[PDB]
Design a protein around this nucleic acid. Structure first.
Length: 50
RNA sequence: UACCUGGUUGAUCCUGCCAGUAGCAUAUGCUUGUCUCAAAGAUUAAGCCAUGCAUGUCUAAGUACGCACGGCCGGUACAGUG
């Protein structure tokens, strides 16, 4: 599944502003960036060994 | 600038100190137009303290669901400022 679609959004309705839903930033979520960070760590290991 | 002068005697030459002399550093007195530097609660009490201030700090890069501001109504988690 994809947790991105199951984050509890909270509704905000104030008089002078249009209503909107606020969502938290999902933490500890695996994204392309963290995978690239792991790749870079392993590549640094390889570079050190070489 | 390697300097002395007055004072013991009726007078003299000494010893010798007192006083003078110049700076320096604190205080104080009188006086004080310009201008440049510039010390300043050490001395007595490391005595006592009203009040205020004197140490805080965020980047692209730890944590943002504070509508506190702020958008592009969305399989659009997180726009951004904060």
């Amino acid at each position: 599944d994809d947790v991105r679609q199951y984050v509890v959004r909270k509704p905000l309705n104030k008089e002078g502003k249009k209503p909107r839903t606020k969502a938290p930033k999902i933490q500890r979520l695996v994204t392309p960036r963290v995978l690239q960070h792991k790749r870079r760590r392993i590549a640094l290991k390889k570079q050190r060994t070489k």
